[PDB]
Amino acid sequence: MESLTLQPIARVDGTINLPGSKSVSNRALLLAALAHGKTVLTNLLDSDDVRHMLNALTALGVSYTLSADRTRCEIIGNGGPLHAEGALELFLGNAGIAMRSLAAALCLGSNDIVLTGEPRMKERPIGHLVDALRLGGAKITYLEQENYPPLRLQGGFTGGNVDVDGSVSSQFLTALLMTAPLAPEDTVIRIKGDLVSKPYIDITLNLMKTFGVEIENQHYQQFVVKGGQSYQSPGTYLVEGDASSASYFLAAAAIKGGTVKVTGIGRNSMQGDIRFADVLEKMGATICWGDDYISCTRGELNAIDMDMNHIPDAAMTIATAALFAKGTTTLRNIYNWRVKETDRLFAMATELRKVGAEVEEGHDYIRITPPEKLNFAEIATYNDHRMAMCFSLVALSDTPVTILDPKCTAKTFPDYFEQLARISQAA
Ligand SMILES: O=C(O)C1=C[C@@H](OP(=O)(O)O)[C@@H](O)[C@H](O)C1
């Protein structure tokens, strides 16, 4: 199959203008499609996940135009719930937010739509969301394995008292939050117990407000939503740079800098992954914050032991950065790595061992003891963009690394390797 071999990188230094945030991009696209008015999104991410959402909107009848680089999108709002019948199939690749958000949104009114995706998407749980949507009146059928896509949605979500489990994915709650305002009746969303990936809920609420809707958040345990609302175009909206994509470059500087500055995100960012910079600081790197940039300068790198539930994606970056740190690193409370693009705890543990680390793959944590020196490995990427980007960092050592299926990074960052190369220096 395809592979890319990265030669050793002696030092990293420079500036990266970040691609748009995937989390913000797909939420903004769905809200813009539901809203009244024309929304112009700028700095929109062009990646597989966004392309699947755009293809879904096209299939649903939403009109929009894209600039040549596909980063500017003018969306003609539908002015209400999107509709389609005839069991129209929407293929969503392995786009989590698109699948979860559309599964909820397309339950408004009457529809007859089927949501599906790549083989792995059919292994990513959606039962907690279906349970909540049904409590609100939705008619949903599992076409294959119970609790997983594909789903046939036949509408009927009207609102009311809805319970939702927030212990496996915050995406179910996000999906319900964006949908409930348009339901005819008021909705009270009660979180059953724990809520993981909490920062992403803040991203959802931020976008909802930008599009004219607010709800009552009672300490993240209950959300009171008024029904009969309408989303309104915010005019020209700037999509923040991707803080998860930034993690690789900031980590690269913490390991082999130099100073690397990423632009497009800053201290005011709504994304929880900007907190990744705080972890690098705890490890010994120096961080500089700006209004539209975050920079990291090499200091030292010491192992850490911390709960990473608040930054599940960027936390993967710490797992490979740990290869360069002094001591044993432990990342805890990351059980849901197991139900994402691949089972990331199994994948990360497996590939880290290939380059020489001693790794304990815990049920919901990972413990990494780096080797005195890394060795060459051909890294399997599990159709997971982040496995490829995380392991690209192995090249910040004396050894090259070969990354299988490098194009899997296109899920959220098509130009990843060219960008890493941009800050890679020989001296
Ligand atoms: O809401 C979002 O944009 C996301 C939330 C996270 O999922 P979980 O809530 O399942 O942890 C994250 O891993 C995913 O890449 C994007």
PDB file of N, CA and C in Angstrom, residues 26-80:
ATOM      1  N   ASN A  26     -18.058  21.631  10.640  1.00  0.00           N
ATOM      2  CA  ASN A  26     -19.278  20.882  10.405  1.00  0.00           C
ATOM      3  C   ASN A  26     -20.477  21.369  11.202  1.00  0.00           C
ATOM      4  N   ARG A  27     -20.264  21.908  12.407  1.00  0.00           N
ATOM      5  CA  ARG A  27     -21.386  22.471  13.171  1.00  0.00           C
ATOM      6  C   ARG A  27     -21.883  23.724  12.427  1.00  0.00           C
ATOM      7  N   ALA A  28     -20.948  24.558  11.972  1.00  0.00           N
ATOM      8  CA  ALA A  28     -21.315  25.790  11.254  1.00  0.00           C
ATOM      9  C   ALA A  28     -22.060  25.482   9.960  1.00  0.00           C
ATOM     10  N   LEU A  29     -21.645  24.429   9.256  1.00  0.00           N
ATOM     11  CA  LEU A  29     -22.324  24.067   8.013  1.00  0.00           C
ATOM     12  C   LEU A  29     -23.741  23.609   8.264  1.00  0.00           C
ATOM     13  N   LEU A  30     -23.937  22.760   9.267  1.00  0.00           N
ATOM     14  CA  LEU A  30     -25.286  22.284   9.557  1.00  0.00           C
ATOM     15  C   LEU A  30     -26.182  23.451  10.015  1.00  0.00           C
ATOM     16  N   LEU A  31     -25.675  24.278  10.927  1.00  0.00           N
ATOM     17  CA  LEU A  31     -26.481  25.400  11.408  1.00  0.00           C
ATOM     18  C   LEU A  31     -26.787  26.380  10.275  1.00  0.00           C
ATOM     19  N   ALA A  32     -25.813  26.626   9.409  1.00  0.00           N
ATOM     20  CA  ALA A  32     -26.040  27.537   8.291  1.00  0.00           C
ATOM     21  C   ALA A  32     -27.100  26.973   7.352  1.00  0.00           C
ATOM     22  N   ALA A  33     -27.118  25.652   7.196  1.00  0.00           N
ATOM     23  CA  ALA A  33     -28.095  25.031   6.311  1.00  0.00           C
ATOM     24  C   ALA A  33     -29.502  25.134   6.916  1.00  0.00           C
ATOM     25  N   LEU A  34     -29.594  25.019   8.232  1.00  0.00           N
ATOM     26  CA  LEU A  34     -30.887  25.093   8.922  1.00  0.00           C
ATOM     27  C   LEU A  34     -31.387  26.528   9.064  1.00  0.00           C
ATOM     28  N   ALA A  35     -30.444  27.461   9.125  1.00  0.00           N
ATOM     29  CA  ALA A  35     -30.773  28.877   9.324  1.00  0.00           C
ATOM     30  C   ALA A  35     -31.476  29.603   8.181  1.00  0.00           C
ATOM     31  N   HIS A  36     -31.984  30.782   8.513  1.00  0.00           N
ATOM     32  CA  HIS A  36     -32.634  31.650   7.547  1.00  0.00           C
ATOM     33  C   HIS A  36     -31.559  32.651   7.188  1.00  0.00           C
ATOM     34  N   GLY A  37     -31.351  32.857   5.892  1.00  0.00           N
ATOM     35  CA  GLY A  37     -30.350  33.806   5.456  1.00  0.00           C
ATOM     36  C   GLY A  37     -29.157  33.115   4.833  1.00  0.00           C
ATOM     37  N   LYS A  38     -28.276  33.909   4.249  1.00  0.00           N
ATOM     38  CA  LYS A  38     -27.083  33.391   3.619  1.00  0.00           C
ATOM     39  C   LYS A  38     -25.906  33.569   4.567  1.00  0.00           C
ATOM     40  N   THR A  39     -25.218  32.471   4.837  1.00  0.00           N
ATOM     41  CA  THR A  39     -24.064  32.500   5.711  1.00  0.00           C
ATOM     42  C   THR A  39     -22.835  32.361   4.842  1.00  0.00           C
ATOM     43  N   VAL A  40     -21.808  33.143   5.141  1.00  0.00           N
ATOM     44  CA  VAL A  40     -20.568  33.042   4.405  1.00  0.00           C
ATOM     45  C   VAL A  40     -19.566  32.587   5.448  1.00  0.00           C
ATOM     46  N   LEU A  41     -19.087  31.352   5.305  1.00  0.00           N
ATOM     47  CA  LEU A  41     -18.085  30.827   6.224  1.00  0.00           C
ATOM     48  C   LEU A  41     -16.707  31.023   5.578  1.00  0.00           C
ATOM     49  N   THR A  42     -15.751  31.547   6.336  1.00  0.00           N
ATOM     50  CA  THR A  42     -14.402  31.708   5.811  1.00  0.00           C
ATOM     51  C   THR A  42     -13.477  30.874   6.706  1.00  0.00           C
ATOM     52  N   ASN A  43     -12.340  30.478   6.138  1.00  0.00           N
ATOM     53  CA  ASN A  43     -11.361  29.624   6.809  1.00  0.00           C
ATOM     54  C   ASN A  43     -11.986  28.265   7.104  1.00  0.00           C
ATOM     55  N   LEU A  44     -12.974  27.894   6.299  1.00  0.00           N
ATOM     56  CA  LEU A  44     -13.632  26.608   6.432  1.00  0.00           C
ATOM     57  C   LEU A  44     -12.582  25.540   6.102  1.00  0.00           C
ATOM     58  N   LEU A  45     -12.624  24.424   6.819  1.00  0.00           N
ATOM     59  CA  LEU A  45     -11.699  23.331   6.557  1.00  0.00           C
ATOM     60  C   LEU A  45     -12.104  22.538   5.314  1.00  0.00           C
ATOM     61  N   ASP A  46     -11.132  22.241   4.451  1.00  0.00           N
ATOM     62  CA  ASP A  46     -11.385  21.366   3.316  1.00  0.00           C
ATOM     63  C   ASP A  46     -10.715  20.046   3.734  1.00  0.00           C
ATOM     64  N   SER A  47     -11.520  19.037   4.047  1.00  0.00           N
ATOM     65  CA  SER A  47     -11.003  17.729   4.457  1.00  0.00           C
ATOM     66  C   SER A  47     -12.104  16.724   4.163  1.00  0.00           C
ATOM     67  N   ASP A  48     -11.812  15.433   4.297  1.00  0.00           N
ATOM     68  CA  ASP A  48     -12.845  14.431   4.035  1.00  0.00           C
ATOM     69  C   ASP A  48     -14.088  14.648   4.878  1.00  0.00           C
ATOM     70  N   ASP A  49     -13.907  14.892   6.174  1.00  0.00           N
ATOM     71  CA  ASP A  49     -15.081  15.046   7.043  1.00  0.00           C
ATOM     72  C   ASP A  49     -15.988  16.186   6.621  1.00  0.00           C
ATOM     73  N   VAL A  50     -15.384  17.292   6.216  1.00  0.00           N
ATOM     74  CA  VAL A  50     -16.188  18.431   5.789  1.00  0.00           C
ATOM     75  C   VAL A  50     -16.824  18.114   4.441  1.00  0.00           C
ATOM     76  N   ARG A  51     -16.063  17.482   3.551  1.00  0.00           N
ATOM     77  CA  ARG A  51     -16.592  17.113   2.239  1.00  0.00           C
ATOM     78  C   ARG A  51     -17.827  16.209   2.359  1.00  0.00           C
ATOM     79  N   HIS A  52     -17.845  15.307   3.340  1.00  0.00           N
ATOM     80  CA  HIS A  52     -19.027  14.438   3.532  1.00  0.00           C
ATOM     81  C   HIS A  52     -20.248  15.239   3.987  1.00  0.00           C
ATOM     82  N   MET A  53     -20.025  16.229   4.850  1.00  0.00           N
ATOM     83  CA  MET A  53     -21.128  17.084   5.310  1.00  0.00           C
ATOM     84  C   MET A  53     -21.656  17.904   4.130  1.00  0.00           C
ATOM     85  N   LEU A  54     -20.744  18.468   3.347  1.00  0.00           N
ATOM     86  CA  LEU A  54     -21.136  19.257   2.181  1.00  0.00           C
ATOM     87  C   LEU A  54     -21.920  18.379   1.195  1.00  0.00           C
ATOM     88  N   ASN A  55     -21.443  17.154   0.955  1.00  0.00           N
ATOM     89  CA  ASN A  55     -22.146  16.233   0.049  1.00  0.00           C
ATOM     90  C   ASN A  55     -23.540  15.894   0.595  1.00  0.00           C
ATOM     91  N   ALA A  56     -23.650  15.803   1.916  1.00  0.00           N
ATOM     92  CA  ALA A  56     -24.936  15.502   2.535  1.00  0.00           C
ATOM     93  C   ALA A  56     -25.879  16.687   2.327  1.00  0.00           C
ATOM     94  N   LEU A  57     -25.370  17.895   2.540  1.00  0.00           N
ATOM     95  CA  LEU A  57     -26.214  19.068   2.358  1.00  0.00           C
ATOM     96  C   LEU A  57     -26.650  19.163   0.907  1.00  0.00           C
ATOM     97  N   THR A  58     -25.742  18.882  -0.014  1.00  0.00           N
ATOM     98  CA  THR A  58     -26.125  18.900  -1.433  1.00  0.00           C
ATOM     99  C   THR A  58     -27.263  17.898  -1.676  1.00  0.00           C
ATOM    100  N   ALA A  59     -27.082  16.671  -1.187  1.00  0.00           N
ATOM    101  CA  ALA A  59     -28.095  15.633  -1.364  1.00  0.00           C
ATOM    102  C   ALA A  59     -29.451  16.029  -0.771  1.00  0.00           C
ATOM    103  N   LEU A  60     -29.417  16.783   0.327  1.00  0.00           N
ATOM    104  CA  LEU A  60     -30.628  17.238   1.003  1.00  0.00           C
ATOM    105  C   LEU A  60     -31.271  18.450   0.324  1.00  0.00           C
ATOM    106  N   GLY A  61     -30.616  18.980  -0.701  1.00  0.00           N
ATOM    107  CA  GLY A  61     -31.177  20.107  -1.424  1.00  0.00           C
ATOM    108  C   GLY A  61     -30.698  21.493  -1.016  1.00  0.00           C
ATOM    109  N   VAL A  62     -29.652  21.565  -0.202  1.00  0.00           N
ATOM    110  CA  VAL A  62     -29.143  22.854   0.238  1.00  0.00           C
ATOM    111  C   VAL A  62     -28.198  23.402  -0.829  1.00  0.00           C
ATOM    112  N   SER A  63     -28.326  24.687  -1.172  1.00  0.00           N
ATOM    113  CA  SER A  63     -27.449  25.290  -2.179  1.00  0.00           C
ATOM    114  C   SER A  63     -26.311  26.065  -1.527  1.00  0.00           C
ATOM    115  N   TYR A  64     -25.120  25.945  -2.094  1.00  0.00           N
ATOM    116  CA  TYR A  64     -23.975  26.676  -1.557  1.00  0.00           C
ATOM    117  C   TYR A  64     -22.924  26.705  -2.642  1.00  0.00           C
ATOM    118  N   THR A  65     -21.949  27.590  -2.486  1.00  0.00           N
ATOM    119  CA  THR A  65     -20.873  27.673  -3.447  1.00  0.00           C
ATOM    120  C   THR A  65     -19.606  27.693  -2.631  1.00  0.00           C
ATOM    121  N   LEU A  66     -18.532  27.213  -3.234  1.00  0.00           N
ATOM    122  CA  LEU A  66     -17.240  27.159  -2.568  1.00  0.00           C
ATOM    123  C   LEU A  66     -16.210  27.914  -3.376  1.00  0.00           C
ATOM    124  N   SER A  67     -15.261  28.520  -2.691  1.00  0.00           N
ATOM    125  CA  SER A  67     -14.189  29.232  -3.374  1.00  0.00           C
ATOM    126  C   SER A  67     -13.252  28.169  -3.971  1.00  0.00           C
ATOM    127  N   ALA A  68     -12.277  28.617  -4.753  1.00  0.00           N
ATOM    128  CA  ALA A  68     -11.332  27.694  -5.380  1.00  0.00           C
ATOM    129  C   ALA A  68     -10.595  26.788  -4.387  1.00  0.00           C
ATOM    130  N   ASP A  69     -10.215  27.304  -3.215  1.00  0.00           N
ATOM    131  CA  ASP A  69      -9.505  26.463  -2.249  1.00  0.00           C
ATOM    132  C   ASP A  69     -10.435  25.768  -1.260  1.00  0.00           C
ATOM    133  N   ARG A  70     -11.732  25.948  -1.495  1.00  0.00           N
ATOM    134  CA  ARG A  70     -12.796  25.357  -0.702  1.00  0.00           C
ATOM    135  C   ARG A  70     -12.783  25.798   0.743  1.00  0.00           C
ATOM    136  N   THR A  71     -12.197  26.964   1.018  1.00  0.00           N
ATOM    137  CA  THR A  71     -12.170  27.451   2.395  1.00  0.00           C
ATOM    138  C   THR A  71     -13.174  28.576   2.637  1.00  0.00           C
ATOM    139  N   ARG A  72     -13.837  29.030   1.578  1.00  0.00           N
ATOM    140  CA  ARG A  72     -14.864  30.061   1.725  1.00  0.00           C
ATOM    141  C   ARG A  72     -16.120  29.413   1.168  1.00  0.00           C
ATOM    142  N   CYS A  73     -17.186  29.426   1.956  1.00  0.00           N
ATOM    143  CA  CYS A  73     -18.442  28.800   1.543  1.00  0.00           C
ATOM    144  C   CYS A  73     -19.610  29.735   1.805  1.00  0.00           C
ATOM    145  N   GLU A  74     -20.421  29.971   0.778  1.00  0.00           N
ATOM    146  CA  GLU A  74     -21.606  30.811   0.902  1.00  0.00           C
ATOM    147  C   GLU A  74     -22.768  29.840   0.885  1.00  0.00           C
ATOM    148  N   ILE A  75     -23.436  29.702   2.028  1.00  0.00           N
ATOM    149  CA  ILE A  75     -24.549  28.771   2.160  1.00  0.00           C
ATOM    150  C   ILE A  75     -25.909  29.466   2.142  1.00  0.00           C
ATOM    151  N   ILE A  76     -26.813  29.004   1.280  1.00  0.00           N
ATOM    152  CA  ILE A  76     -28.158  29.575   1.258  1.00  0.00           C
ATOM    153  C   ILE A  76     -28.942  28.779   2.303  1.00  0.00           C
ATOM    154  N   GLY A  77     -29.291  29.432   3.402  1.00  0.00           N
ATOM    155  CA  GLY A  77     -30.033  28.753   4.454  1.00  0.00           C
ATOM    156  C   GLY A  77     -31.378  28.196   4.025  1.00  0.00           C
ATOM    157  N   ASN A  78     -31.732  27.025   4.557  1.00  0.00           N
ATOM    158  CA  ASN A  78     -33.013  26.392   4.223  1.00  0.00           C
ATOM    159  C   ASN A  78     -34.172  27.019   4.973  1.00  0.00           C
ATOM    160  N   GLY A  79     -33.855  27.736   6.045  1.00  0.00           N
ATOM    161  CA  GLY A  79     -34.886  28.371   6.840  1.00  0.00           C
ATOM    162  C   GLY A  79     -35.759  27.356   7.549  1.00  0.00           C
ATOM    163  N   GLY A  80     -35.121  26.375   8.171  1.00  0.00           N
ATOM    164  CA  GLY A  80     -35.871  25.370   8.902  1.00  0.00           C
ATOM    165  C   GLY A  80     -35.304  24.000   8.631  1.00  0.00           C
TER     166      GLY A  80
END
